[PDB]
C-alpha cells in the first residue's frame, strides 16, 4: 500500500511531471500524476469553493471548483475506491509553496462520510463542518506549517505580515479516523466542500491546495514540498 | 407531456416491450423501456432496501437493491439530467399489479436534495425521512389505490384481510415541491432510500415499485395500469 | 379561529395591546399578548439573526436573536405543545408595516423537525433549507405582500425602489404540512433559524417579523395587518 | 480531577449515598449524587431507548429513556452547562457492575453537536451514528473491559459465554474532541441517543449505564468501580 487518493487544485505547471501546460484541477490516485485533468483558473485574492463526490456503486469521483461569477471547472475520474483505500482512513487537506508562493488559506471546510448497508438507516455516519476555525483547534491533527489565524481561518502554509511564504507545506486532518468501508457494507459514499483563498502579490504563483483521503496515520512525506503537495515523496 | 426520470424494481418480464427476460432493477429515462437494466431476484416476503443516487458533476444515476444475507444487484447510467429536467419537481414511489399480484408495501422512505453554490451554505436543501407512517399522512400526496394501514407501512396497491389485489395502481408524492436546479447552481444532487416488502400466496408476481422523479403537477397517467407501473401512457 | 404559536420581533411598542415600552422579542401563545418578552435593540440596516428551540421533553419554548458585533437577547417560556397545536401544522415566517414603515426582509431561512421513538430511526423528519430564495419559490405559500426579489431575498412586506411601504402585510408558508407531534411518539422536536434585515430611513419604525406554526389551512386573518403582525384578528 | 456531566441508567439503588430506593434514571453535575432523579423500571431482556437533548438559550438538560410502549420515564434539570464545562469536550458512554451483575450492551449510537456562534451555516457542527459497531473501532477510544462483541455491539462490561462478569467497569469515547462552547458563541446544543440491552439471569442486577460528557483527556477515575458507574473517584 501507501495510499493517498486526492483532488488537486494545481496552481503552478510542472509540464516535466506530467502536468498540463497551464493551471489545472486534477484527480491523483496514488501519484501525482494526476489520472484525469481539467482547465483552471486561478483567480488571484477571491474566496473559492470547492465540492467532492463519490459513491461506491456509481464508482465515479468527480469534484468542482468554483468562483463566484459563474466561472467554474468540473474534473471526473472513475474508479473503485473499495479497492484502493484501507477501511479506515484520515481525511484532510493540505498545501505547499515553492519558490513562488500565494496564502493557502481555509475559510471553510465540510465532510460527510455514509457507510449503511442494509435495513437502511446508518450503520455508521460522519459529518463534520468548520465555518470558523478556532484558535487551537483540538479536533485536528495540524502538520507542518498548518495553524489557524486570528481570523478563525486555516493558513496551510506559513503568512508573515500579510505576506506568503516560501517553500512552506501544511496539512490538517480531522481528528477522527472515518470508516470508509466494511465488508458487510452495501454502500459507501462520501461529500466534501471548502472555501479557499488564494493571494499573492506576484502573478507567478505556487504550488496548490488539495484535499486527501490517507491512512490513518499518514504525515507529511519528504521530498513533500513544492508541486508534491505535501502528498507523495517522489513524482512516479 | 408527464416527464418521468425513474428506478423500477420490476417483479415480471414483459419483453415485448423491451423488459428482459428476468426479474430486474432499470433506470427509465421518459420511458418505460430501461436505458439500463440489471438482473435482480425478488425474495418473496422478506424486507428489501434500495439506494438511489444523482450528482450533477458525476452526472450519473445509480441504484442498489439489496436484502440481508448478501443478495444485491446496481445498475447506473450516465446522463445529464439538468437537460432532462424541469427546474421544479416533485418526488414519489408508485406501484402496480397486472391479473398477478403482489404486496407493494414502504416500510420506510429517505430522501435528500441539496442545490449548491460558492459556500458550505446549501442555495436550497430538502431533506425528510420517514420510518413509519402516519395514518393520515398530511405530506404525502396518494393518488390511485396507495394508503396507509393499520402499522404505520405504505400500501401503494390494494390489500384486503392479508392477500394482495390484481389491477391495482398507486403512487405517493412527498407535499413539497423538490427544487432540482437554478441558475446560481453550481452542484445539484440527491439521494433516495427505501426499504420494501413484496409478498404473494402465488410464485408469479407482477408487477413491481418505483421512485419516480417527474413535474410537480403529475398524475397517474390513463392506461399506466400494471406493466407501465404508474409512470407512463403509452410503452412508446 | 386560527392556532397560531410564534416568536415576534416587535420592532414597535404598542403599550395599549400589552407591548412593553421597548423594542422586544416575544413568545406568542394563542395571542398577539406575549407570555414572555425581553428587551430587544433594532440595527437599522444591519443584518440579524435568530434562532428558535423546542424539545416536547423538555417543554421549554426558546428564541435568541443577535446581530453581528455582540448584541444579543434571549427569551424563553415553558409550555407544552402537545397541548396547544394540532398533530398537524404549517411553519411560516409573517411580517408587518403600520403607519410606520420598515423592510422586512429574509435572506435565508431554516427548519428541522424530528419525531422519535425506540431507535435513532427518527420516525419521521423533515429539514429545508434556504439561502436563497428562487423568483419563484413553488415551495414557499405566499400570503399578503410577500413576493421575491431579484436578489434572491424575501421581502415578507412590500418595497418600492428601494423604500419599504406603509400599511404592508406578508406571510410566507413551507409548502408541506409538518407532522409535529404523532401520538406513538417519544420525543418532538424542531429547530428554526432565519436571518433578516430591517432598514428605514426613518429612525421611528414598524412593525416587526414573526416565526409561526399554524394550523396548515392558516391565512392571513382579516384585519391583522399592524401591532399584529399578520398573526391575529384581534389583540386578545 | 475529572470534570464530568452525565446521564444516569442506575440499576441499583445505593441509599447510604443519595440514590431513591428503586432502579431510576438522572442527572449528574459533577458528583454521582444526582441533581434530580425519576422513577425507571429496568425490563430484563429488552431493547432499551435513550435520547438526551440540550440547548443553551433554554439552559434546561432533559433525558427520556423508554421501552416499545408504554412505557418511558423522563428526567431534566435547568442548568448553564457552559459555565460547567471546558470548552473543548469528549462524549462518551460508561458502565459497571457489582457484585451483582448484569450487560451493558449498546446496539446504537448517534451525537449531534451544534456550534452557532454564527447565522445557520454553523460556526462548527459534528454529528456521528453508529448502528453496527466495528469489531475494531478505529474512531472510538474504548476504556474498560469495553469491547465491541462479533455481533456489532458494544459491550461496555465483560461478558464471558453469553454471561455477563461481577465487578466490570468499561468506557467508550468518541475520538474527535467537541467543541462544546467559545467566546464568540451565541447558541450551542446537542443531542444523543443510544440503544441498550440490560439483561441478566440473577433476579438482581447492577449498576447501570451512562452517557457522559467529560474534559478531553479523561479515564477512568480510581474508585470508580460498581455504584460510581465508572464516573467518579469518590461519592460527594
Ligand atoms: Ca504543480
Ligand atoms: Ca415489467
Ligand atoms: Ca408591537
Ligand atoms: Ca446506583
Ligand atoms: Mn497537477
Ligand atoms: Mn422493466
Ligand atoms: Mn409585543
Ligand atoms: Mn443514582
Not at 151 to 155: A, E, H, K, V, Y
Given at each position: 500500500a501507501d495510499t493517498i487518493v486526492a483532488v488537486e487544485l494545481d496552481t503552478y505547471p510542472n509540464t516535466d511531471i506530467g502536468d498540463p501546460n497551464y493551471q489545472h484541477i486534477g484527480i491523483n490516485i496514488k501519484s501525482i500524476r494526476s489520472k484525469a485533468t481539467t482547465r483552471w483558473n486561478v483567480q488571484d485574492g477571491k474566496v473559492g469553493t470547492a465540492h467532492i463526490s463519490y459513491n461506491s456503486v456509481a464508482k465515479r469521483l468527480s469534484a468542482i471548483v468554483s468562483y463566484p461569477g459563474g466561472s467554474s471547472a468540473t474534473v471526473s475520474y472513475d474508479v473503485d475506491l473499495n479497492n484502493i483505500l484501507p477501511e479506515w482512513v484520515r481525511v484532510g487537506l493540505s498545501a505547499s509553496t515553492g519558490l513562488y508562493k500565494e496564502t493557502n488559506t481555509i475559510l471553510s471546510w465540510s465532510f460527510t462520510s455514509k457507510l449503511k448497508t442494509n435495513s437502511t438507516a446508518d450503520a455508521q455516519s460522519l459529518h463534520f463542518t468548520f465555518n470558523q476555525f478556532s484558535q487551537n483547534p483540538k479536533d485536528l491533527i495540524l502538520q507542518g506549517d498548518a495553524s489557524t489565524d486570528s481570523?478563525?481561518?486555516?493558513?496551510l502554509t506559513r503568512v508573515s505580515n500579510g505576506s506568503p511564504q516560501s517553500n512552506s507545506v501544511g496539512r490538517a486532518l480531522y481528528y477522527a479516523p472515518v470508516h470508509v468501508w466494511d465488508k458487510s457494507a452495501v454502500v459507501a459514499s462520501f461529500d466534501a466542500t471548502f472555501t479557499f483563498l488564494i493571494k499573492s502579490t506576484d502573478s507567478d504563483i505556487a504550488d496548490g491546495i488539495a484535499f486527501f483521503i490517507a491512512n490513518t496515520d499518514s504525515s507529511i512525506p519528504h521530498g513533500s514540498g513544492g508541486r508534491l503537495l505535501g502528498l507523495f515523496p517522489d513524482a512516479n
Open positions: 481570523d478563525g481561518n486555516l493558513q
